[PDB]
Design a protein around this nucleic acid. Structure first.
Ligand SMILES: [Mg+2]
Ligand SMILES: [Mg+2]
Ligand SMILES: [Mg+2]
Ligand SMILES: [Mg+2]
Ligand SMILES: [Mg+2]
Ligand SMILES: [Mg+2]
Ligand SMILES: [Mg+2]
Ligand SMILES: [Mg+2]
Ligand SMILES: [Mg+2]
Ligand SMILES: [Mg+2]
Ligand SMILES: [Mg+2]
Ligand SMILES: [Mg+2]
Ligand SMILES: [Mg+2]
Ligand SMILES: [Mg+2]
Ligand SMILES: [Mg+2]
Ligand SMILES: [Mg+2]
Ligand SMILES: [Mg+2]
Ligand SMILES: [Mg+2]
Ligand SMILES: [Mg+2]
Ligand SMILES: [Mg+2]
Ligand SMILES: [Mg+2]
Ligand SMILES: [Mg+2]
Ligand SMILES: [Mg+2]
Ligand SMILES: [Mg+2]
Ligand SMILES: [Mg+2]
Ligand SMILES: [Mg+2]
Ligand SMILES: [Mg+2]
Ligand SMILES: [Mg+2]
Ligand SMILES: [Mg+2]
Ligand SMILES: [Mg+2]
Lengths: 129, 175, 98, 49, 106, 197
RNA sequence: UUGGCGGAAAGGCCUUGGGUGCUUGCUGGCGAAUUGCAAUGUCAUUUUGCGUGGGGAUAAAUCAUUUGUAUACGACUUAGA
RNA sequence: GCCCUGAAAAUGGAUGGCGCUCAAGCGUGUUACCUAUACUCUACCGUCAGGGUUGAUAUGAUGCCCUGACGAGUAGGCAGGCGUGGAGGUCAGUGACGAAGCCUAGACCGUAAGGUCGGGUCGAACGGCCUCUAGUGCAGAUCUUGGUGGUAGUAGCAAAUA
RNA sequence: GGAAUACUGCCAGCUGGGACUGAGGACUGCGACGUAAGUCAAGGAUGCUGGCAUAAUGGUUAUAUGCCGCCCGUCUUGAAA
RNA sequence: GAAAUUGUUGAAAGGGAAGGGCAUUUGAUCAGAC
């Protein structure tokens, strides 16, 4: 498969959503810090939402790794894929979103002939059977 | 180029472990488990059966026998934490148990190499038991039944099943 | 509960009938077939592309109120791309047979 | 409190009380107390019970 | 015979709590027949099953099990503390659980 | 241990009984309380009647139909103490209160069943001798309950029937004991005695 | 199956006389395995549905028309196959 | 010492509530038990400090590694990063076998700002990295302009004889 | 007169039960046991076994339950006002 | 051809507001992989 690697631990899996993004449509869900002088979220009263902190950060040995155990590298063509030729156990390739189907079949055939895992095969390649 | 390459790559050279310092020493069983003891089975398909303890194996299991004629439990292995040892004892010093080991109960576990009856390919054919197994059962039954004919009601005791009644507190209970 | 009649169970009867009716609804939906099959089933799309347009195209190629239609523009694009893929597979098996 | 437990009626009621039991008397088949009138047949014994 | 039981009955009382904060990771179990912590020390490290039924059959059965273990005693009156693999659903405060006789020592 | 526990409320103290019944209900046991007109409260009759009048005085001033409702039956006085001792606004407390039934007298089908007592709520075990106590039927009759004579007549009828039943069962127990004592001084009786039975 | 009894919410309790099964009260003969060293390892209780299965039972209410002992409108109270 | 009196004001109410009388009250004593983001031990993140490491074939000497301690915060200071419109260079980058945009009870990465993939819609342009530049990031200002609600099928459509 | 037992304290005395954790990754150090090669519980977990191989574990999502949770921005010594 | 706002269909919840946090049950849905 991939390289042997330890168990991956996530200290927080729920998203950090901005306060009152459920009352108003004008308030988006992207995180913004509460800066008001009377804010219960800023003053950290019991029963309110949590805020991002540096203590939540993940282990350096398993950071950026997918559940398979690879790191994702974005690939646009065959030279980009041939960059990853001697690192098939740490990196997995991924075809970019704007590559067409005619070039995706060429990228996938080269990836199979060389041994690189592709995280998104079958994308844009229905009707090929 | 959708991405620029890393300046560094971690090595795909797999490392070896350090020298570990954990040696295997044999089990230290309970002081209520000596061969000849009547045990109560707590889990399994033979729940609540009274069984006779014969031999301690090398994989930390116990060799047990019903006998097969008094309650229908064959020569089996069992785990020592899944059993209750009682204070009744029979004489096991007339039985030869020097042939049973792990390779005796070794099973052809070839189903993990693509079992065509994973669920079932036939759901039938009613698997057959070997004559060597049946003969070992017969000789140990003879040597044990000759000894457990000597105390009264012991055969009836080994035939009957164990169960908890109303108001039976197991922490206050002798066995 | 319900001070007009304190010796009668109210909430537990409501919860009992409620979960019975919910499980009846689930069995009716499963027998009508409005649920996805098993993952190991022979008509499971798990792992592949989910596409309303491709499903409608292949269903009408094989051949009561709904809100999923097909759009002739997209249908012409599907027919063109299928001809491209057929030319590719014909090139492949022509090279293989030669 | 008080609880009613048994009601007994007579064998021959009239059209005025039957009109009381109906809301649309001009359309009805006037079927009221027709099975109850059979309780007085020879023994019957439900009346006496 | 007429009885086939090989477990002890208990009741799920509540979570661990102070007065206005609870802790769903630890449950409190009342074992039937235990009055003291010296008698509850027999049941430490025994396995518990919460057995319940569902209407959708999953893998040959409509009966589902949650597994846990006894960890320590709680208080002066024979209640014990327990942890489960997944925490108990909290609508079962007052429901009954099964304490098995294994892993055995006597 | 029983599926339903039936408690004879004669001679118990009201709050000490309500505390243990509330804990049993929250732990998940079904309780039926009979003879709720025979309960006791510690203190004089006049003092307890004045406490009930202080309760009777409280009502919603702009609409008396919205206010606290003052129920006059002894079973309802007991229920008011129990509802105070549970948290009845939640679904857990509602289910716990739906595990309970309270009656005056012993109606069917509970007049053929076994009734128990609670020793830590009993008046002869808890009150100091010489103290005064109140009876709940008299208190409820003085504050407005109107069925004290009907219940007394029905309870007299039930007592006559259960006295006949007990005479029959006592004669049967006598002949069974005489038949059992003549099979003692047997060999299996001596073996049972050595094993302790 | 023969009788009684039970109205507080009886909805249950007692009994007669024959059929027929079991009996561990005592003594014998076979059987059980492989669920593989545990996995609740599924055992009591219910209301129907598709019409097939057996006798039996053939109704009313509302709108519309009308009255005024009623009425803001609904409602109420009358009449008419 | 304890108890009763030792003056109380107007909606129905408060040892928190139920309730409690050899207490579930008051005085005193001895044990057991319950639980804080506090204490102890372990892991992980970050910051600070003290140190080790020349061999190029293998990487980032701004790297890799070892050890110890610490972490609240308004006004305010400083640092490291995320995103947008244009400019120079590069990837002989992506694109009618479908660019940008928009929708998405699908998937992944990051503490986060955000980034990436799938599907639908669409029909002609647009990105990554190294740098340059600014009319560069909104929930508020009885903000500006445009659009749309509840109120609500409601108030009402009754002067001047028909 | 001769003891014992309480109470307080010590042991580099033995021994049973339960829970949580397993960081690190060739060797290097300090020791222990043995006359010595060796062995070891001595600078951080290994050994043996079973089931399942998919929606089973797990994620997302809609709810239910237990406990907790006042409306944001702003001036003020003082904001749910 | 975005949002506010609205219609139809499907699923759900509802004894005097709704929304939120921690934890799990139930239903629906889903990726990885051996
Ligand atoms: Mg995340
Ligand atoms: Mg302030
Ligand atoms: Mg108190
Ligand atoms: Mg005191
Ligand atoms: Mg303690
Ligand atoms: Mg600190
Ligand atoms: Mg800080
Ligand atoms: Mg600041
Ligand atoms: Mg500009
Ligand atoms: Mg730009
Ligand atoms: Mg091109
Ligand atoms: Mg596009
Ligand atoms: Mg959405
Ligand atoms: Mg970007
Ligand atoms: Mg460029
Ligand atoms: Mg500007
Ligand atoms: Mg803007
Ligand atoms: Mg705005
Ligand atoms: Mg602002
Ligand atoms: Mg405007
Ligand atoms: Mg109008
Ligand atoms: Mg006007
Ligand atoms: Mg006019
Ligand atoms: Mg390790
Ligand atoms: Mg799931
Ligand atoms: Mg789950
Ligand atoms: Mg779920
Ligand atoms: Mg609160
Ligand atoms: Mg404020
Ligand atoms: Mg919209």
């Amino acid at each position: 498969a991939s390289l042997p690697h330890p168990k991956i631990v996530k200290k927080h899996t729920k998203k950090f959503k901005r306060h009152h993004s459920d009352r108003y449509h004008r308030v988006a869900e992207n995180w913004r810090k509460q800066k008001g002088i009377d804010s219960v979220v800023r003053r950290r009263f019991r029963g309110n939402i949590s805020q991002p902190k540096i203590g939540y950060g993940s282990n350096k040995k398993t950071k950026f790794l997918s559940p398979s155990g690879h790191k994702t590298f974005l690939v646009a063509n065959v030279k980009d894929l041939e960059t990853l030729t001697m690192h098939t156990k740490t990196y997995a390739a991924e075809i970019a979103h704007n590559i067409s189907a005619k070039n995706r079949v060429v990228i996938l055939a080269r990836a199979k002939a060389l041994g690189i895992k592709v995280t998104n095969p079958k994308g844009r390649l229905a009707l090929e059977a | 180029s959708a991405q620029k390459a890393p300046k560094w790559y971690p090595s795909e050279d797999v490392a070896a472990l350090k020298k570990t310092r954990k040696a295997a020493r044999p089990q230290k069983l309970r002081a209520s488990l000596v061969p000849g003891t009547v045990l109560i089975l707590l889990a399994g398909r033979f729940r609540g059966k009274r069984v006779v303890y014969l031999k301690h194996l090398e994989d930390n299991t116990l060799l047990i026998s019903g006998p097969f004629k008094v309650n229908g439990v064959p020569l089996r292995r069992v785990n020592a934490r899944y059993v209750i040892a009682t204070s009744t004892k029979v004489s096991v010093e007339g039985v030869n148990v020097e042939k049973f080991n792990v390779e005796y109960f070794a099973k052809e576990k070839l189903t993990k190499k693509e079992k065509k009856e994973a669920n079932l390919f036939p759901e039938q054919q009613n698997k057959e038991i070997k004559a060597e197994r049946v003969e070992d059962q017969k000789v140990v039954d003879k040597a044990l039944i000759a000894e457990i004919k000597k105390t009264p009601l012991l055969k009836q005791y080994l035939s009957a099943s164990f169960s908890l009644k109303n108001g039976d507190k197991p922490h206050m209970l002798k066995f | 509960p319900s001070k007009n009649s304190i010796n009668r169970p109210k909430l537990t009867s409501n919860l009992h009938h409620k979960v019975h009716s919910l499980n009846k609804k689930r069995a009716q939906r499963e027998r009508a077939g409005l649920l996805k099959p098993a993952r190991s089933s022979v008509n499971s799309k798990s792992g592949e592309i989910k596409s309303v347009a491709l499903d409608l195209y292949f269903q009408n190629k094989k051949n009561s109120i709904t809100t999923r239609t097909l759009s002739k523009k997209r249908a012409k694009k599907i027919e063109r791309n299928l001809k491209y893929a057929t030319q590719r597979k014909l090139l492949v098996d022509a090279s293989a047979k030669l | 409190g008080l609880r009613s437990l048994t009601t007994v009626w007579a064998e021959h009621l009239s059209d005025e009380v039957k009109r009381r039991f109906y809301k649309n008397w001009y359309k009805s088949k006037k079927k009221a107390f027709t099975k109850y009138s059979a309780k007085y047949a020879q023994d019957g014994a439900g009346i006496e019970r | 015979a007429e009885s086939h039981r090989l477990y002890v009955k208990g009741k799920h009382l509540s979570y661990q709590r102070s007065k206005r904060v609870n802790n769903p990771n630890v449950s409190l179990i009342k074992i039937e027949g235990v009055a003291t912590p010296q008698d509850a020390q027999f049941y430490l490290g025994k396995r518990i099953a919460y057995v319940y039924r569902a209407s959708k059959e999953v893998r040959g059965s409509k009966i589902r099990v949650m597994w846990g273990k006894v960890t320590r005693t709680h208080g002066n009156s024979g209640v014990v503390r327990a942890t489960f693999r997944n925490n108990l659903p909290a609508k079962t405060f007052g429901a009954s659980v099964r304490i098995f006789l294994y892993p055995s020592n006597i | 241990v029983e599926p339903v526990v039936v408690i004879d409320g004669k001679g118990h103290l009201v709050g000490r009984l309500a505390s243990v019944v509330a804990k049993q209900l929250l732990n998940g046991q079904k309780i039926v309380v009979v003879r709720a007109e025979e309960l006791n409260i510690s203190g004089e009759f006049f003092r307890n009647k004045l406490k009930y009048h202080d309760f009777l005085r409280k009502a919603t001033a702009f609409n008396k139909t919205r206010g606290p409702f003052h129920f006059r039956a002894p079973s309802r006085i007991f229920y008011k103490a129990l509802r105070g001792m549970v948290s009845h606004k939640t679904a857990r407390g509602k289910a716990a209160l739906e595990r309970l039934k309270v009656f005056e007298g012993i109606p069917p089908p509970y007049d053929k069943k076994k009734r128990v007592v609670v020793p830590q709520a009993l008046r002869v075990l808890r009150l100091k001798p010489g103290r005064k106590y109140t009876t709940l039927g008299k208190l409820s009759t003085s504050v407005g309950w109107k069925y004290e004579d009907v219940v007394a007549k029905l309870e007299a009828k039930r007592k006559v029937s259960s006295a006949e039943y007990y005479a029959k069962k006592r004669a049967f127990t006598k002949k069974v004991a005489s038949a059992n004592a003549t099979a003692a001084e047997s060999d299996v009786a001596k073996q049972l005695a050595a094993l302790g039975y």
